[PDB]
From Swiss-Prot, chain A:
It comes from Homo sapiens (Human). It comes from the Eukaryota. This is Insulin B chain. Changing H10D: In HPRI; Providence.
């Protein structure tokens, strides 16, 4: 399903979803 | 970096998962 360019601030939306419970932001 | 990469190209799940904590 990772099928598209992620522009705007859609990269953090994608990371939020795919990284799930472990997260991604900061440390 | 990843912001530029994933806007100008289609990132894979591999590439995104490199940025998970």
């Amino acid at each position: 399903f990772v099928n598209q360019h992620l522009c705007g601030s859609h990269l953090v939306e994608a990371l939020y979803l795919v990284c799930g419970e472990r997260g991604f932001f900061x440390x | 970096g990843i912001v530029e990469q994933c806007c100008t190209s289609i990132c894979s799940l591999y590439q995104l998962e490199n940025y998970c904590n």
